[PDB]
């Protein structure tokens, strides 16, 4: 009963960031060595835990959230950050305990004519709470006049596509991101490293 991390990391397609995917991992033995012993990752930052200790630790549940963003947006997947992604698409808590892992996926998610399957939320009335997911497509009301589901002056569609192309600067290229959350509740631990 090993935890299925390869399903998350090696999935053929990833979610739009506004509709980020979440895999809930319970009741299993987790071998994180396949992660921290790999050299394919361009971002690997853990908060509240060192990755080299993960095989010796136990948690109530583990969460793996996955999505695609721009490379120059990966810095927003961190506690306390702001920006379009952190404010409107995927927000981490200040007291986050977990890892943020990102790799360049230009070879997979870019198209010469643009990949318009990947979207992000551009307009929102307020910032997202931590771990909140909003997939609504209501017309954004920029003013005080109700929009009645119609685009116009101060009435804007809230989603926008990345349109990923094989650009020359890596900061514009698409990056796949997995965020691992390690949950500790007042309950028996169900996800444990092989050493425990």
């Amino acid at each position: 009963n090993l935890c299925p991390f390869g399903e998350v990391f090696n999935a053929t397609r990833f979610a739009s960031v506004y509709a980020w995917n979440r895999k809930r991992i319970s009741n299993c033995v987790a071998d994180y060595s396949v992660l921290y012993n790999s050299a394919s990752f361009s971002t690997f930052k853990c908060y509240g835990v060192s990755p080299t200790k993960l095989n010796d630790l136990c948690f109530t549940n583990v969460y793996a959230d996955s999505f695609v963003i721009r490379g120059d947006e990966v810095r927003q997947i961190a506690p306390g950050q702001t920006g379009k992604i952190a404010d409107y698409n995927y927000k981490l808590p200040d007291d986050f305990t977990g890892c943020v892992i990102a790799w360049n996926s230009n070879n997979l998610d870019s198209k010469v004519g643009g990949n318009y399957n990947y979207l992000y939320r551009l307009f929102r009335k307020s910032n997202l709470k931590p771990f909140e997911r909003d997939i609504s497509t209501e017309i954004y009301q920029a003013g005080s006049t109700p929009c009645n589901g119609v685009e116009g002056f101060n009435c804007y569609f809230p989603l926008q596509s990345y349109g990923f192309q094989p650009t020359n600067g890596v900061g514009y290229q698409p990056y796949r991101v997995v965020v691992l959350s390690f949950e500790l509740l007042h309950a028996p631990a169900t996800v444990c490293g092989p050493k425990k």
Epitope: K45, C46, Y47, P79, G80, D94, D95
Partner: antibody, heavy 129, light 108 residues
């Protein structure tokens, strides 16, 4: 929505002490370190020290050791900087500044991230009779 | 302590030009060097962290480079609201220290 709001400008006599407050809102107070940085009028920036908002441990710059005390009250999400034996050189704008959290990289090494993304509005402290 | 020498102390340039100021450290500080912009009477605002990374929300016209002892900060298209004093700051080793500053003015 992070807000750092500092106490008002004050005048203090030489040899006395001043306590500047910094009230934090919009984030989990105990998750971040808080630093203090001062600026004498028309001069540059000077780092004073750092306090752990969780446990209240502190570390001060040498030139302020023995003279500065940094405290925190988690109930009110407030950080305090107290400077004693005030001289004319202590006349300055005092700032609380907040950097992001530290993190561990893939190799297990602790990485610090002490760039100040948030600042209070500053507190002018004038040392004069 | 680690001393940060900024250059030039002040300078002026017209709108649209490229500006490159420098910060030199007494010892090796790796890439743990940040650049702040202080508009008159306000708190310093972070523009560049770890000597090359653009802070979120900062216009793309700002950039920085360096590792070791010598660092540079560059504005590509000078803009009216760039009037400020710019400071470098290291955190490779306590105590944290700032540079002397560089006051940028605009010719018109």
């Amino acid at each position: 929505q992070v807000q750092l709001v500092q106490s008002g400008a004050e005048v203090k006599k030489p040899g006395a002490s001043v306590k500047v407050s910094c009230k934090a809102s919009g984030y989990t107070f105990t998750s971040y370190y808080m630093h203090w940085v001062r600026q004498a009028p028309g001069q540059g920036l000077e780092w004073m020290g750092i306090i752990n908002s969780s446990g209240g441990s502190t570390s001060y710059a040498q030139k302020f050791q023995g003279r500065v005390t940094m405290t925190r009250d988690t109930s009110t999400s407030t950080v305090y900087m107290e400077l004693s034996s005030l001289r004319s050189e202590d006349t300055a704008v005092y700032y609380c500044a907040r950097p992001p959290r530290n993190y561990y990289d893939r190799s297990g090494y602790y990485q610090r991230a002490e760039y100040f993304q948030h600042w209070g509005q500053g507190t002018l402290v004038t040392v004069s009779s | 302590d680690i001393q940060l020498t900024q250059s030039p102390s002040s300078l002026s340039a017209s709108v649209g030009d490229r500006v490159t100021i420098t910060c030199q450290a007494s010892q090796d500080i790796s890439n743990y060097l940040n650049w702040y912009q202080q508009r008159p009477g306000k708190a310093p605002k972070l523009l560049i962290y770890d000597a090359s990374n653009l802070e979120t929300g900062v216009p793309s016209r700002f950039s920085g480079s360096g590792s070791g002892t010598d660092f540079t900060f560059t504005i590509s298209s000078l803009q009216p609201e760039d009037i400020a004093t710019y400071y470098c700051q290291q955190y490779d080793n306590p105590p944290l220290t700032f540079g002397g500053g560089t006051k940028l003015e605009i010719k018109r």
